Every structure is written in C-alpha cells, then in structure tokens.
Amino acid sequence: YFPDAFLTQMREAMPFDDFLAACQRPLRRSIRVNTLKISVADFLQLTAPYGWTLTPIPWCEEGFWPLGSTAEHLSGLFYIQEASSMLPVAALFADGNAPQRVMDVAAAPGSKTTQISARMNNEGAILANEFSASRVKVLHANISRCGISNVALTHFDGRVFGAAVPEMFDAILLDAPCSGEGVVRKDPDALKNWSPESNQEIAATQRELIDSAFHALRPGGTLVYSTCTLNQEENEAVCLWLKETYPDAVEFLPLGDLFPGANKALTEEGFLHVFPQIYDCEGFFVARLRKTQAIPALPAPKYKVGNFPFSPVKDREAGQIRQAATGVGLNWDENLRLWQRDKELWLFPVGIEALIGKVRFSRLGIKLAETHNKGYRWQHEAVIALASPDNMNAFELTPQEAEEWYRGRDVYPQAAPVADDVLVTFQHQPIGLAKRIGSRLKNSYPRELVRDGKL
Numbered sequence: 205y206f207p208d209a210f211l212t213q214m215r216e217a218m219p220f221d222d223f224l225a226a227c228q229r230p231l232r233r234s235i236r237v238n239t240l241k242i243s244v245a246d247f248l249q250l251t252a253p254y255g256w257t258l259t260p261i262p263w264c265e266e267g268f269w270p271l272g273s274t275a276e277h278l279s280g281l282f283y284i285q286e287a288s289s290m291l292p293v294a295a296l297f298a299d300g301n302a303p304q305r306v307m308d309v310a311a312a313p314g315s316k317t318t319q320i321s322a323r324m325n326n327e328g329a330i331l332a333n334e335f336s337a338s339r340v341k342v343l344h345a346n347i348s349r350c351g352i353s354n355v356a357l358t359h360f361d362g363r364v365f366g367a368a369v370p371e372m373f374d375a376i377l378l379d380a381p382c383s384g385e386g387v388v389r390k391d392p393d394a395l396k397n398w399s400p401e402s403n404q405e406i407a408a409t410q411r412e413l414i415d416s417a418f419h420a421l422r423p424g425g426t427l428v429y430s431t432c433t434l435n436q437e438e439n440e441a442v443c444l445w446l447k448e449t450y451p452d453a454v455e456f457l458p459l460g461d462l463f464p465g466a467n468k469a470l471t472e473e474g475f476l477h478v479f480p481q482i483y484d485c486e487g488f489f490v491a492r493l494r495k496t497q498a499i500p501a502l503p504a505p506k507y508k509v510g511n512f513p514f515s516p517v518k519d520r521e522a523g524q525i526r527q528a529a530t531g532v533g534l535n536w537d538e539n540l541r542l543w544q545r546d547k548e549l550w551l552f553p554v555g556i557e558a559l560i561g562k563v564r565f566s567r568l569g570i571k572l573a574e575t576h577n578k579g580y581r582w583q584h585e586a587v588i589a590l591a592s593p594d595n596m597n598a599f600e601l602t603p604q605e606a607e608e609w610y611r612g613r614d615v616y617p618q619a620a621p622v623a624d625d626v627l628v629t630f631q632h633q634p635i636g637l638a639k640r641i642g643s644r645l646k647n648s649y650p651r652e653l654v655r656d657g658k659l
Contacts, residue, residue, distance in 0.1 A: 207398055210385070217436065218479075226481030231389040232259075234485075236283040236290060237266045238350050240322045241633060250631060251276060262483065263463040264290040266322075273659055275603075278610060279633040280350040280588060285315040288386065288478065288486035289379075292430040293319045295476075295492045296377055298462055301426055303375030304328035305555050309362050309417060310379055312339035314346030320377070321352040327539050329555025331373075331563075333358040333365070340566060345653075348570075351589035351634075353540060354553040357566040363412050366419030367504035369562050374425040378417045380410045382431035382438050386487020389480060407437045414446055418454070419502065421495050426457065429491040439489040440475065446493070453497040459490060509564050514550060517542040525549065525580075529572065532582060532637065533597065533627040534590040540569065547575040551586075582637050584650050587627075591634030597623050598632075606630040612654030615645040 206227075214223070235258070237247045244266060248258075254274075261267030267290050276282055293316050296303070304327070311317045311332035320330060332347075332355050334340050340359055347355050383403055388394045414429055421427050431438055447454045458474025460466050465483070469476040476490040517525070522542045529535070540551040552569040559565075570589055573580040605615045609628065615638075624640040638645045 205393055205396065206388070207395070209400065210395070210398055214434065217434075222481040223479055226484065227388055227487075229389065231286065231486060232269045232484065233271065234261070234285060234287045235268050235271075236264065236285050236319060237268075238281055238283060238318065238322055239266060240326055240351060241279070242281045247276075247281065250281075261287050261290060262465050263294045266319075270658065273655065273657060275606060275630060275659070278349075278655070279630060279635060281631075281633065283315060283318055283346075283350070285319075286390070286486055287483070288432070288488040289315045290319065291476065291478070291488060291490050292316060292377055292379055292428050293323065295428045295430075295459060295462060295490050296320065296375055296426060297323050298459070298492070301375070303373075303425065305330075305373050305558075306375045306377070307331040307333065307365070307373045307417075307420065308377050308379075309333055309365070309413065310335065310381065311357075312336065312343045314343045316377060316379065317343065317355060318346060318350045318352060321347075321350070321354055324354065326352065326354050327537070327555075328354060329553035330355045331358060331556070331559065332356070333360055333362060335359070335361060344567060348585040348588060353536070353551060353570050353589050354555060356552075356556050356559070356568040358563055359566045360563070363416045364507075366416035367502040368507065369420050369559065370501070371422040371498065372420050372559065372562075374422050376417045376421050376425070376427045377430070378414055378427065379430045380413055380438070380442075382406060382410070382433035383435070385433040385435065386478075386480065386489075387432050389486060403435065403437055407442060410438055410442045411445060414442060415449065418446060418450070418493075418495065419499070423495050423498050425495055427493045427495070429489075429493070431489045432487065433489070434477070434479065434487045439477065439491070440471065440473065443473070443475065443491045443493070450499050453495055453499050455494045455496050457492045457494055459492055509561060512560050514543040514545045514552075514568075517544050517549070525572075528580060529582075529590070532625055533592060533595055533634075534572070534582065534586060535592055536590055542572070543569075549573040549575065549580070584636060584648065587634055587637045591627055591637070593627070593629045593632045593634055595627060597621070597627060598629050599623075599626050600632060601628060601630045601635070603630075606635070607659045609635060609647060609649055610655040610659060612647050612649050612651060614647050616643060617645065 258268040312334040317332045460470045478488040480487045571583045572586045
C-alpha cells in the first residue's frame with residue numbers, strides 16, 4: 205500500500221513500472237558470513253549438505269541471497285541481514301579504507317555493527333550507539349553471538365555526539381531514521397503514516413544528525429550517510445545541505461567503482477540511489493563523504509560525565525589472569541587490555557580508551573570473568589569470542605550432543621575428556637565452557653538463550 209502523493213512523485217523522480225512490480229513482491233532471504241569465525245569458502249564447504257541456492261551479492265563478497273534455528277547461526281558464523289544494509293558498510297571500507305575508530309549511530313539490531321567489526325578484523329574499536337533502550341539488549345546479544353570484542357555501547361540521541369566528542373572518529377556510519385519507503389517489501393504497510401510534512405521534519409532530524417556526525421568526524425575521515433527511503437528530501441537534499449554548510453570541508457567520494465554494476469545506481473554526485481528493482485532488493489540510499497578540513501568548534505560540553513566505574517588491572521595481577529585464561533582456552537590480542545569493577549573482570553579495546561569520560565557508556569568490550577574465591581567464572585560471552593578451537597583440549601560434539609547443549613541440557617560423551625574444564629566445539633567452533641563432573645559436562649549455555657524448539 206502506497207499513498208497517491210507518493211506514487212505520483214516517485215513517477216517524477218524515476219531515471220518505473222518494474223519498480224511498482226518489485227515494490228509489491230517480498231524480499232529475498234539474505235545471509236552474511238562472519239569471517240571472524242570462518243572463511244567464505246569454508247562456509248560454503250560446510251553448509252553444502254543443506255542444499256541452498258545462494259546468489260552472490262555484488263557489493264559484498266561475504267554476502268548471499270528456519271534460519272535462526274540452524275547450528276551455524278547459533279555459533280555465530282552468519283548474520284541474517286538484508287543486502288541493502290550491507291551496502292553502507294561496504295562503502296565505509298571501499299578503496300582500502302581501514303579506519304581504526306568507528307561510530308555506528310543507529311546500531312540496533314547489530315546487522316551493520318557486526319559487519320564493521322569483522323571488516324576491521326576485530327581490531328581498533330567501535331562505538332555502537334542506539335537510541336531505544338529495548339533495542340540495546342538485542343544489539344548486545346547479537347554482538348556477543350558473533351564473538352565481537354571491539355565494541356562499546358552507548359544510549360544517546362545521536363545529535364549529542366558532534367559536541368560531546370569532536371574530531372574523535374576516523375569513520376562514521378550514519379544510517380538515518382527515515383520514512384522507510386524502501387522497506388515496503390519487508391512490510392506491506394510500512395509507510396501508511398507517510399506525508400510530505402511528516403517528511404520535512406524527518407529531514408530536519410536527518411540534518412542535525414549528519415551535522416552531529418560530521419562534527420564528531422576527525423579531519424581526513426569518511427562518513428557514510430544511508431537511508432531506507434527513496435525521495436530526495438531525505439537523501440540527496442541532506443548531503444547537499446551538509447556541503448552547503450561546510451563548503452570547503454566536505455568532499456563527496458563517488459561510489460561508482462564500488463562493485464561491478466554500481467554504475468546502474470550512480471548519481472551525478474557519486475551517491476548510490478538504489479531503487480529496489482535495480483538489483484532485486486530493498487530501496488536504499490548511500491552517500492560517502494570525506495572531511496578535508498577542521499571545521500569551527502561548538503560550545504557544547506554541558507553533560508559532565510562523572511566517575512568511570514572501572515579501573516585498569518595492575519600488571520602483577522593482569523599477567524596472572526592472562527595465564528589463568530590461557531590455561532582454559534581463552535586468548536586475546538594486544539588490541540585488548542584488562543579492566544576491573546567488582547569481582548568483575550572486563551576486556552576493553554584500547555581504541556576506546558580515548559572516549560572514557562567524554563561519554564557515559566552503556567557497556568564496553570567483553571566481560572571476561574567474575575572472581576569467586578581464588579577462582580574465576582568465565583563468561584559465556586568471552587568463550588564465544590576468545591576460545592581457540594584448534595586446541596589439544598577442545599572437544600567436538602556430535603550433532604546429537606550439540607542439540608542437547610542448545611536445549612540447555614548436560615552432555616554424556618563416549619570419549620569423555622580428561623580436562624576438568626572442557627572447551628566444547630561444534631563444527632570446530634567454540635560453543636560454551638563446561639565443567640567435567642565425573643562423566644557429565646555440565647550445561648553452561650546462558651538460559652536467556654536456551655533454544656525452545658527444533659534444530
């Protein structure tokens with residue numbers, strides 16, 4: 205369903221029928237491989253038995269066309285995400301762009317965040333901001349599932365960043381809340397409350413969003429602006445505005461070589477204005493800019509953000525934890541350093557350090573452990589992230605035994621390893637960390653996730 209005003213002005217902005225057609229047909233199931241865990245080729249090899257046809261996505265070598273309840277999804281080897289969300293992320297790293305400190309402004313539900321992480325090879329650091337509180341917990345679950353460690357979370361109104369955190373990021377991805385015209389294929393009533401007035405104010409929001417972003421972008425950095433909507437007010441008009449506001453500071457960086465076929469969607473400015481029927485998918489806009497120059501300062505550091513509840517772990521102790529963890533299969537890069545709050549023990553990415561005190565964080569990095577007596581309760585989240593499977597104390601489950609784990613039940617091996625603490629893999633992926641207890645392997649899969657159904 206489509207309002208008259210909207211169609212009879214999509215008619216006057218087409219460079220059409222095919223579009224009405226593609227508009228009205230449902231989206232293709234779409235999947236993205238997580239190379240933090242498995243290579244593409246390996247993935248293809250591994251899921252060949254399931255007999256799916258998979259069309260390659262042109263702007264994402266890692267992208268392809270009951271999903272959530274498949275082993276591979278549970279061990280975090282792929283993300284269920286739409287091809288259009290892949291595009292902004294691809295732009296962000298186009299032409300060997302290799303940013304080390306990145307913000308995702310509207311990060312839930314995690315689709316893009318996870319993808320950026322994988323592309324940075326889990327190095328550097330990311331600030332994933334999400335405005336809605338409820339969506340934050342979704343974001344976090346999704347991050348923890350993919351074993352991402354370079355992410356910190358905030359809960360802010362996006363507009364704040366420009367003033368709060370000046371030339372902080374070397375890349376930003378601003379996927380702006382829009383009028384969702386491109387999303388009628390996922391939701392046949394999506395727009396229904398659509399109106400040109402309602403759009404003028406949405407565009408007003410998108411202005412101050414992108415200004416905030418630009419402000420928080422270090423000189424030299426790239427910013428990618430994307431929406432799910434197809435009109436010019438919210439897209440080209442918003443980018444063009446930014447350039448008018450900072451004429452000597454903003455450079456559009458054409459996206460035409462982004463992939464083969466990109467030309468089909470290329471705007472005179474170098475944006476990709478992807479109509480749904482062009483590549484058979486969602487309706488989407490992608491714009492990439494670079495800040496070429498420092499721009500004037502804002503006041504506006506009003507929010508004095510008070511004590512940070514964690515302290516960096518001292519060297520004597522940090523060493524002993526590193527060795528205690530290694531002894532159980534967990535390992536970290538030089539990208540990560542150990543902090544502490546209570547019995548709690550966290551790893552933060554050094555990339556994020558510089559932000560401490562300029563923003564209140566919802567969460568940072570990963571909880572490695574909680575101290576208990578002389579010991580440690582290793583967190584599931586850290587096992588997914590830091591566990592090396594190719595080990596001599598790994599233990600591979602049978603499919604039968606794997607299903608049991610995910611239904612949150614104890615497992616009884618014929619083998620029956622020697623370790624009192626056993627790193628449990630399936631398809632040779634870290635799946636959880638279990639205690640021995642004689643012959644039994646106790647289930648330590650967090651209950652908030654114990655699968656209810658079929659597998």
